[PDB]
Amino acid sequence: SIAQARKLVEQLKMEANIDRIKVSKAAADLMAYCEAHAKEDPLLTPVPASENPFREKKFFC
Amino acid sequence: SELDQLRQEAEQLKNQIRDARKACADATLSQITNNIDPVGRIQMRTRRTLRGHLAKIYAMHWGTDSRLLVSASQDGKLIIWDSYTTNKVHAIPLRSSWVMTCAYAPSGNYVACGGLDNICSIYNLKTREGNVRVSRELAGHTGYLSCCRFLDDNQIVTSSGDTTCALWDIETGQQTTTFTGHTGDVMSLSLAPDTRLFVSGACDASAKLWDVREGMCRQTFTGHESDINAICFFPNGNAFATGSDDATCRLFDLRADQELMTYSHDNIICGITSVSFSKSGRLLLAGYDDFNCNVWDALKADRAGVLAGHDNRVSCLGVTDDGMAVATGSWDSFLKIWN
Amino acid sequence: SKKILLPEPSIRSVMQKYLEDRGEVTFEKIFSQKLGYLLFRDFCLKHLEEAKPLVEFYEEIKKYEKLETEEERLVCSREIFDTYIMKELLACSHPFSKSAIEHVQGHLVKKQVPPDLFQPYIEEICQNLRGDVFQKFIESDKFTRFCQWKNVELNIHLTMNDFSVHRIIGRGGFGEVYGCRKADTGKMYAMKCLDKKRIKMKQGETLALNERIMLSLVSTGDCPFIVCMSYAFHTPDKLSFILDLMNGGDLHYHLSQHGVFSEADMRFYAAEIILGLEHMHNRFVVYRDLKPANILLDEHGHVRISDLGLACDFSKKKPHASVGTHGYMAPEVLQKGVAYDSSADWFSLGCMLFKLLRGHSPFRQHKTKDKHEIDRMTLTMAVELPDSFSPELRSLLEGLLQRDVNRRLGCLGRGAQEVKESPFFRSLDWQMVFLQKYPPPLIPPRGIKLLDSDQELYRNFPLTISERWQQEVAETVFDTINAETDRLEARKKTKNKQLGHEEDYALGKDCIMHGYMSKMGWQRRYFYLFPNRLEWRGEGEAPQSLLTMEEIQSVEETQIKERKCLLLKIRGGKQFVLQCDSDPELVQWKKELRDAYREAQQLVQRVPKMKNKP
């Protein structure tokens, strides 16, 4: 486990040397993703049954 | 000794991590989202019940056309279905009864599964000679296949109870890249959209983020107090979710390098088994060992809806690429689609 | 009906496992059973090129053993050498050793040709058939058929309905001896039934027990000179023994009608008896009750030794008691506290023979219930002999009837072989006695209480003697039934090929065992046991229901209306019951179902995704 605790160190050497961001920037960014793409998400913005295969679509190419 | 002159160094680097993060933590998503309208009531209804397996379903996966979907089961059989009609496309008797996962190559051409044979079997579905035959068996893992996902017809990533993942070159049949780090059975994984990274979650209650191309682990997120059963990337690839035996989900962010949110209730006590996002990422779907499947406001952490339909554990589940619909699998043996 | 019927070929799945578990799937164990041999050789003769010249050679050696004279042996050993040795050897096709070829050539060039001339070639043949050749046999339709028959063998449950009865043939003391026929086959048989009420009354339980124990030691090896047993079974009221049939009465009843026999005529009964004795003594049984009345005649006038009630296993503990009829027991037998072996029969045999000649026991001078004066004319009179007698006959009787065991024929030397080397039998060819070729001197003319601590004294009493049942089948129905059930099976294979065969569902997966059983809800389905589940179907469809190993809490065996059945306890409190076509099948479904589920539950407890949680 000696040569092995060495791995765990030089691996945390990695994890800690990243360039981070502020949680507030991180959350705003998501929050604008959802906003920008909600028109498209059918589970939020219904489509005509005309087009919904699990409701009233009839033709399928 | 020399081991405690390094285990104490492990404690002083963990803390420089616990530092950079608490310094990033100016606000919380639940505060930044406090202003936007709640999502409203999500009362989706079962639209197709897929009947065919003779016992528990353990995994399932949409093909990129949001019409076809593979499932695997205790009945040693693999079904592929065609959700629009309910017809079976292929029933695939397996070599091993003990399957646990399955997967659909994006191209359509192959599917893959494995289980306690410790093998990841690729199947050809457009065999030159109009047939469905095994076309590769990927041996190398020293534990059970727990998940897998193709990157194209020639590459696939697997996660194993041996505590490792790997990327395969299917022609070569050998691990082109290995992923050590986890200290317990790897249980799920999600490739991200760039398919340049991928995240794994495991029984060490940690999720890890891996560079496909390089082979190294970049970031390790913790917080759950129990096995992480499932995991899903948010659609923009800068964040991801998990599900655990601790009865919660959480969403993590990669650039903030820490946990953003927690979804839970004081009433929900059994563990999550699966998770996945709606096309915008605004909703987080989550299966539960209590036969239910909860729909959450990913951004406000309120429970938007419930899909009550199975008479047993919801083993698995999964939203369509075009967002049209949600499949769920369960121990009761039936898959159900909802809209 | 009464007729035999083989299980369908799918029985193999279960039988091959039953056999494999008991170590019965080996060259030696199969090749030395009559039905294994027949199937083994059809496979070798019709279906494998490399194997014919070894079986042909085998069967030709085997004929060579059974020849009688040096003349015939000489010629036929030259034909075997020329064909099986020299022909192959000149065609680069002789699998045998440089030493093998010289053992034969060395005796043949000196015109010495014993029946065992070819023994080295036997062993080498088996080495040649015991490996690849054998494994290709297992992989084949013929092993399948072996299983079909073997299933029938191990599923034998005899009653009274399984025989047609004809005529009485004798009255014993506990019961009677009918003559009869197995509907199965037609084998002509005899049936000895023994009333349990009379036994328990007469206290012949020790005696009844003994006979059966003794008939099973004595009844292997088609032995001409003993009435042997093929079966035994019980009913609530009667014990049957199924024995070789013999219609022609005893020598005590033929001494009654014919009068004393000529020295040349006892010589024929003696020869036959002594081979009957040799049989018991190679197998460590002293007969002890040798007399005329215990010698029965068949329809042509051959004899066999009859009641085994009083015989004895001396292999381990030598008997020391007085046992047998009073005129024919040796001085060791009469001595209180003195060990003896097969020397008791040789003095008895000299005693019974002298009777045939002169009309009474040598020591019996017409005293009736005064067994005392018989037992002291034995221990002090060196029996005086008539002048009538030959000097050849006079010295066999002196030989056989020495009181002290140190001295008598059959005792210090080489057992029964010394008697056969006596001057009295110098004319005989013992091989020809054994083959029953000497002509017989007499060709017979035309003719209240019942407990359950007493019924347990008869469990582990039904018995079937594999070797005898396979002899019976081989000589009666075996060929016509192998031709029969071939036709069914190829006609089923023609039928399934017109509808659309299943490329059988058990292939290519990890299926453990499969085969017909019936269940509750009977319904007779075809099951498939897999490591994590049991699946079933009705004829025509594919498995559409099942039961997982996870949900089985326990597999026991419970009696349901006189039937051996499987009780299957399940998670919800829910019971499932099964029933198979044959004992071997029960035993193997119970075994493979318990390993399957215990081992499944061990696996699953270890896998976080499949084990069940809070």
Q: What is the CATH number of the domain that holds C62?
A: 1.10.167.10
With an 8 Å Cβ cutoff, are C609 and B146 in contact? yes
CA distance C295 to C268: 13
Same domain, C225 and C264: no
| Tokens coding C16 | 């091959």
Q: How far is B202 from chain C (nearest CA, A)?
A: 11
Residue C477, amino acid: V
CA distance linking residue B169 with residue B75, whole number of Å: 29
Token pair listed for B338: 């909802």
Answer whether B54 sits within 8 Å of C608, measured CB to CB: no
Note whether B302 and B285 are within 8 A (CB).
no
Query: Which residue is it, tokens 């009295």?
Result: C424
C317 and C402 belong to one structural domain: yes
Question: What phi and psi, each to the nearest 5 degrees, are found at residue C180?
Answer: -165, 180
For residue C64, the 8-state DSSP code is: H
Residue C41 and residue C30: Cα distance in Å, rounded?
11
The dihedral sign for the CA sequence C421, C422, C425, C427 = positive
DSSP C361: -
* Among the listed residues B273, B277, B275, B300, the one whose alpha carbon sits nearest the alpha carbon of residue B289: B273
Which residues are within 8 A (CB) of B154 and not within 5 positions of it... i.e. 6 or more apart?
A: B169, B170, B171
Answer whether B316's CB lies under 8 Å from B58's CB.
Answer: yes
Residues C355 and C425 placed together within one structural domain of the fold: yes
- Separation of alpha carbons B119 and B122, rounded Å: 10
User: Encoding tokens for residue C96?
Assistant: 């045998």
C344, C221, C216: which is closest to C275 by C-alpha?
A: C221
d(CA B109, CA C563): 54
| Residue-wise burial string across B151-181, b where 16 or more C-beta atoms lie within 10 A, e elsewhere | bebebbbbbbbbbbbbbbebeeeebebebeb
Q: Which residues of B touch C508 (CB under 8 A)?
A: 93, 95
CB atoms within 10 A of CB C257: 10
Q: How many residues does chain B have?
A: 339
- Whether C345 and C203 map to the same domain: the answer is no
CA distance to partner chain C, nearest, from residue B270 (Å) = 7
Ramachandran angles phi, psi of C484, nearest 5°? -70, -60
Q: What does the alpha-carbon distance between residue C545 and residue B54 come to, in Å, rounded to a whole number? A: 6
Asked if B280 lies within 8 A of A44 by C-beta distance, the reply is: yes
CB atoms A43 and B216 under 8 Å: no
Helical ranges in C27-97 per DSSP H: 27-31, 34-47, 52-65, 70-80, 88-90
Please give the tally of structural domains in chain C: 5
- Amino acid, single-letter form, for residue C408: R
Closest Cβ opposite residue C543 in set B54, B161, B229: B54
- Indicate whether C85 and C210 sit together in one domain: no
Q: Which two tokens stand for residue B169?
A: 């070159």
- Tokens 């049942």, residue? C469
Say if residues C513 and C75 touch (Cβ distance below 8 Å): no
Per 3-state DSSP, what percentage of chain B is helix, strand, and coil (rounded to 5)? Answer: 5, 50, 45
**C471 and C442 assigned to the same domain:** no
Torsion of CA B210, B215, B218, B223, to 10 degrees: 50
Return the DSSP state at C582. Answer: S
Torsion on CA atoms B149, B150, B155, B157, rounded to nearest 10: -10
Q: Distance between CA atoms of B123 and A21, rounded to whole angstroms?
A: 43
Residue C1 token pair: 């009906």
B251 φ, ψ to 5°? -110, 130
- Kindly calculate the radius of gyration of chain B based on its CA atoms and give it in whole angstroms: 20
In terms of phi and psi (left: phi > 0; alpha: psi -120 to 50; beta: otherwise), the region of B181 is: left
Residue C14: give its domain's CATH number.
Answer: 1.10.287.1270
Which of B96, B100, B269 is facing C609, going by the closest CB pair?
B100
Q: Going by C-beta distance under 8 Å and a sequence separation of 6 or more, which residues neighbour residue C356? A: C251, C255, C260, C261, C265, C266, C269, C292
Q: Which helix (H) or strand (E) holds B121?
A: strand B119-124
CA C290 vs CA B87, C176, C264, C332, C348: distances in Å: 84, 21, 20, 15, 6
Q: What are residue C468's phi and psi, to 5 degrees?
A: -70, -45
B279 Cβ contact partners less than 8 Å away, ≥ 6 residues apart: A37, A40, A41, A42, A43, B235, B319, B321, B322, B323
Homologous superfamily in CATH for domain A1-60: Transducin (heterotrimeric G protein), gamma chain (4.10.260.10)
- Is the Cβ of B299 closer than 8 Å to some Cβ of chain A? yes
- Tokens found for residue B136: 């590769």
> Nearest C-alpha of chain A: how many angstroms from B29?
5
**Integer CA distances (angstroms), C366 to C216, C350, C371, C385, in order:** 38, 19, 10, 17
**Domain spans in chain A, listed from the N-terminal domain onward:** 1-60
Cβ neighbour number for residue A19 with a 10 Å cutoff:
6
Give alpha helix (H) positions in C284-429.
331-334, 343-358, 372-377, 391-400, 416-420
Q: Which residues in chain C are contacts of B203 at CB distance < 8 A?
A: 608
Which residue type occupies B119?
I
SS3 C138: helix
Which resolution, in Å, applies to this structure? 2.5
- Token readout for A50 is 């005309």
Closest alpha carbon to C7 in C579, C547, C515? C515
Whether C614 is in a domain gets the answer no
C-alpha count within 13 angstroms, C-beta hemisphere, residue A6 = 5
How far is B156 from B175, CA to CA, in rounded Å? 10
Residue C257 identity: Q
- Strands across the sheet containing B77-82: B57-62, B68-73, B77-82, B87-93
Query: What span, in angstroms and rounded, lies between the C-alpha atoms of B290 and C14?
Result: 41
d(Cα C285, Cα C279) in Å, to the nearest integer? 9
**Quick one: CA dihedral B172, B176, B182, B183, positive or negative?**
positive
- Strand ranges across the sheet with B239-244: B228-233, B239-244, B249-253, B258-263
- Tell me whether chains B and C touch (3+ CB pairs under 8 A): yes
Q: Please, what is the Cα angle at C262 between C392 and C244, to 5 degrees?
A: 105
Nearest-neighbour CA in chain B from C504: distance (Å):
12
Q: Which residues on adjacent β-strands are paired with residue B138?
A: B120
Q: Alpha carbon of B82 to those of A43, B91, B126, B310, B325: distances in Å?
A: 21, 12, 16, 20, 13
- Please name which of C217, C178, C94, C102 lies closest in space to residue C467, comparing C-alpha atoms: C217
Q: Taking a C-beta distance cutoff of 8 angstroms, is the pair C57, C145 a contact?
A: no
Question: Which residue on chain B is closest to A27 by alpha carbon?
Answer: B29
Please give the distance of CA A34 from its chain centroid, rounded to a whole number: 10
The residues pairing with C342 across neighbouring beta strands, listed in sequence order, are none
Tokens 């080498």 belong to which residue?
C124
Chain B residues whose beta carbon lies within 8 Å of the beta carbon of residue C510 = 76, 95-97
Residue partners of C62: CB distance under 8 A and separation at least 6: none
**Which residue matches tokens 């492990």?**
B10
Same-domain check for residues C223 and C313? no
- Give the neighbours of chain B: at least 3 Cβ pairs within 8 Å: A, C
Which residue type does C378 have?
Answer: T
Q: Which of C532, C544, C609 sits opposite B97 (nearest CB)?
A: C532
Distance CA A19, CA A30 (A): 19
**Binding-site residues from annotation of C:** 169-177, 192
Question: Coil, strand or helix: which one is C339?
Answer: coil
| β-pairing verdict for B303-308 and C188-195 | unpaired
Assess C572–B contact: CB distance below 8 Å, yes or no. Answer: no
**Identity at B236, one-letter amino acid code:** N
Residues B55, C546: C-beta atoms closer than 8 Å: yes
Distances, alpha carbon C553 to alpha carbons C310, C548, C565, in Å: 52, 11, 17
**DSSP-derived secondary structure for B64-81:** TTSSEEEEEETTSEEEEE
Domain boundary, last residue among C130, C147, C181: C130
Residue in B closest to A4 by C-alpha: B3
Please name which of C552, C88, A20, C375 lies closest in space to residue B257, comparing C-alpha atoms: A20
Burial category of C480 from C-beta neighbours within 10 Å (exposed 0-12, middle 13-18, buried 19 and up): exposed
Tokens of B135: 């076309």
Task: Check CB contact of B307 with chain A, cutoff 8 Å.
Answer: no
Contact B145, B118 (CB under 8 A): yes
| Number of inter-chain CB pairs under 8 A, B vs C | 59
DSSP secondary structure, C502-557, as one string = ---TTTTS---EEEEEEE---EEEEEEEETTEEEEE-TTS---EEEEGGGEEEEEE
b/e per residue B57-67 (b: at least 16 CB within 10 A): bbbbbbbeebb
**Among the partner residues B33, B219, B324, nearest to A42 by beta-carbon distance:** B324
Q: For residue C134, report the phi and psi dihedrals to the nearest 5 degrees.
A: -60, -45
Q: Which helix (H) or strand (E) holds C106?
A: helix C98-108
B161 vs chain C: nearest CA distance in angstroms? Answer: 9
- Which domain range does residue B88 map to? 1-339
Query: Within B1-145, where are the H helices?
Result: 4-22, 29-32
Q: How far apart, in Å, do the first and last CA atoms of chain A sit? A: 61
> Are chains A and B in touch, 3+ Cβ pairs below 8 Å?
yes
Instruction: Report the alpha-carbon distance of residue C73 to residue C117 in Å, rounded.
Output: 10
- Rounded to 10°, the helix C466-475/C478-499 angle is 80
Which helix (H) or strand (E) element contains residue B101? strand B99-104
Output C85-92 pairs: Cβ under 8 A, ≥24 positions apart: C88/C53
CA B262 to chain centre: 18
Closest CA to B107 of B159, B61, B164, B150: B150
| E-state strands within C172-237 | 176-182, 188-195, 229-234
Rounded Cα distance, C138 and C260, in Å:
59
CA separation for the pair C533, C556 (Å, rounded): 18
| Residue A34 neighbours by CB under 8 Å, 6+ apart | B280, B281, B282, B298, B299
* C436 and C583, same domain (yes or no): no
Mutate to test the interface with B, among C527, C609, C612, C613 (most CBs of B within 10 A): C609
Tell me the residue range of the domain where C118 lies. 51-130
Question: String of b and e for C582-593 (b: at least 16 CB within 10 Å)?
Answer: bebbbbbbbebb
Q: Following CA atoms C407, C412, C418, C424 in sequence, which dihedral angle do they give, to the nearest 10 degrees? A: 10
Q: What is the nearest CA distance from B124 to chain C, expressed in angstroms?
A: 17
How far is residue C366's CA from residue C380's CA, in Å, rounded to a whole number?
A: 18
User: How far, in Å, CA of C517 to CA of C566, rounded?
Assistant: 10
Q: Is B239 on the interface with A (CB under 8 A)?
A: yes
Whole-angstrom Cα distance, residue C188 to residue C166? 10
Contact between B281 and A38 using a beta-carbon 8 Å cutoff: no
Could you confirm whether C289 is annotated as catalytic? Answer: yes
CB contact under 8 A, B55 and C543: no
CA quadruple C331, C333, C338, C339: dihedral, nearest 10: 120
Which residues contact residue C554 at a Cβ distance below 8 angstroms, ignoring those fewer than 6 apart? C567, C568, C569
CB contact under 8 A, B280 and A13: no
H helical segments located in C340-460: 343-358, 372-377, 391-400, 416-420, 430-434
- Classify burial at C541, counting beta carbons within 10 Å of its beta carbon; exposed 0-12, middle 13-18, buried 19 or more: exposed
Radius of gyration of chain A from its Cα atoms, rounded to whole angstroms: 24
Give the gap in angstroms from C-alpha B96 to the nearest C-alpha of chain A. Answer: 34
Tokens of C495: 């039928």
Interface A:B, Cβ pairs < 8 A:
161
- Determine contact: A16 vs chain B, CB below 8 A: yes
Pairing of strands B239-244, B249-253: antiparallel
State how far the alpha carbon of C453 is from the alpha carbons of C456, C459, C461, C463, in Å: 6, 11, 15, 21
Q: Does B43 touch chain A (CB under 8 A)?
A: no
C-beta separation of B323 from B278 below 8 A = yes
- What does the alpha-carbon distance between residue C241 and residue C214 come to, in Å, rounded to a whole number? 12
Of the residues C184, C244, C250, C289, only one is catalytic, namely: C289
For the sheet containing B197-202, what is the strand order?
B186-191, B197-202, B207-211, B217-221
CA distance B169 to B175: 7
CA dist C385 and C394 (Å) reads: 7
* Cross-chain residue pair A33–B281, CB shorter than 8 Å: yes
Looking up residue B245, the CATH number of its domain turns out to be 2.130.10.10
Chain B residues at the C interface, defined by Cβ less than 8 Å, are 54-55, 58, 74-76, 93-98, 100, 116, 144, 146, 161, 185, 187, 203, 227, 229, 245, 269-271, 289
Report how far residue C188's alpha carbon sits from residue C211's, in angstroms, rounded to the nearest whole number. Answer: 22
Q: Verify that C339 and C410 share a domain, yes or no.
A: yes
N-term to C-term CA, chain B: 62
Residue C84's SS3 state is helix
Q: Is the CB of B97 less than 8 angstroms away from the CB of C509? A: yes
Tokens, residue C612: 């069940």
Radius of gyration of chain C measured on its C-alpha atoms:
30
The Cα C609–Cα B230 span in angstroms is: 10
Cα nearest neighbour of B245 on chain C: C613
d(CA B101, CA B150): 13
Domain CATH code at residue C206: 3.30.200.20
- Provide the annotated binding site of C for ATP: 169-177, 192
One-letter amino acid of B151: L
B321: amino acid identity, one letter: D
> Which of B76, B227, B270 lies at the smallest CB-CB distance from C614?
B270
CB B56 within 8 Å of CB B99 = no
Total of domains in chain B: 1
- B13–chain A Cβ distance below 8 A for any pair: yes
| Exposure of A12 in the CB half-sphere (CA atoms within 13 A) | 17
User: What kind of experiment solved this structure?
Assistant: X-ray
- CB of A44 less than 8 A from some CB of B: yes
Domain match, C224 and C87 both: no
- Contacts for C440 with CB less than 8 Å, ≥ 6 apart: C268, C300, C301, C302
CA dihedral B93, B98, B101, B102 (to 10 degrees): -10
Q: How many CA atoms lie within 13 A of B241 on its CB side?
A: 31
Tokens of C491: 């006609």
